[PDB]
UniProtKB/Swiss-Prot annotation:
A GO biological process held by the record: antibiotic catabolic process
Part of the intact protein present: 43 to 270 of 270
Subunit (UniProt): Monomer.
Cofactor note: Binds 2 Zn(2+) ions per subunit.
Names of required cofactors: Zn(2+)
Species of provenance: Klebsiella pneumoniae
Enzyme class: hydrolase
Physiological role: Confers resistance to the different beta-lactams antibiotics (penicillin, cephalosporin and carbapenem) via the hydrolysis of the beta-lactam ring. Does not confer resistance to the polymixin colistin or the fluoroquinolone ciprofloxacin.
EC number per UniProt: 3.5.2.6
Protein name: Metallo-beta-lactamase type 2
Annotated gene: blaNDM-1
Length: 228
């Protein structure tokens, strides 16, 4: 029988699925985290792990069962447990991993395993292509500091989808979440930078809410404005 801890999958587009897994921050709510699985021809690409290696391995099993293509690479969007808690599982599987250089630098401080490869960014926020080879339809953008100093975002070419990770909250959210590591001065402008980077995206995917419209962007920014 399927259990509450087992990842759940939602097909967002013909070649894109959301993974959702529930984790436990001690003393706090047990809570859900989303990432993406993208089919690009003969391979699969991932955005973020689950919050644990066990759940990440259950994700890779699903991919094997349901898609049966090799996972060529994963991009992870910041050095927090919900996004990088399954790096060992990825590495055990032979999956090449990539994160903001800054995420890799912060990883030991945040108790996550670093990715194998570092992404760097132009002053525009767009990833340097030499650091993101063969990413297929993944278009990586660093919007500036928000939820964390290192948070990155990923557009999916050939679809209506952009992934804001933990930077973006849905259009009915009442809070930006935990701000202990947030850049409260720049959060609003980074949210806006994200929305300007992926003007085509009509479906906004994020870590802790189900997918929403672009109103999630405007709403998160207008919440952030109140922190300055
Ligand atoms: Mg582990
Ligand atoms: Mg921390
Ligand atoms: Zn986070
Ligand atoms: Zn998060």
């Amino acid at each position: 029988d399927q259990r509450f801890g087992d990842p759940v999958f939602r097909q967002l587009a013909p070649n894109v699925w959301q993974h959702t897994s529930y984790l436990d921050m001690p003393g706090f709510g047990a809570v859900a985290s989303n990432g993406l699985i993208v089919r690009d021809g003969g391979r699969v690409l991932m955005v973020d792990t689950a919050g644990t290696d066990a759940q990440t391995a259950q994700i890779l099993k699903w991919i094997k069962q349901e898609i049966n293509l090799p996972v060529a690479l994963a991009v992870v969007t910041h050095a927090h447990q919900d996004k990088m808690g399954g790096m060992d599982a990825l590495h055990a599987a032979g999956i090449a991993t990539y994160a903001n250089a800054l995420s890799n630098q912060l990883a030991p401080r945040e108790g996550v395993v670093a990715a194998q490869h570092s992404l760097t960014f132009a002053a525009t926020g767009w990833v340097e292509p030499a650091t993101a080879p063969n990413f297929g339809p993944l278009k990586v953008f660093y919007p500036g500091p928000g939820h964390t100093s290192d948070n990155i975002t990923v557009g999916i070419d050939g679809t209506d989808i952009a992934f804001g990770g933990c930077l973006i909250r849905d259009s009915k959210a009442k809070s930006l979440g935990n701000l202990d590591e947030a850049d409260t001065e720049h959060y609003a402008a980074s949210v806006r930078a994200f929305g300007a980077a992926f003007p085509k995206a009509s479906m906004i995917v994020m870590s802790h809410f189900a997918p929403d419209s672009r109103a999630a962007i405007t709403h998160t920014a207008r919440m952030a404005d109140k922190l300055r």
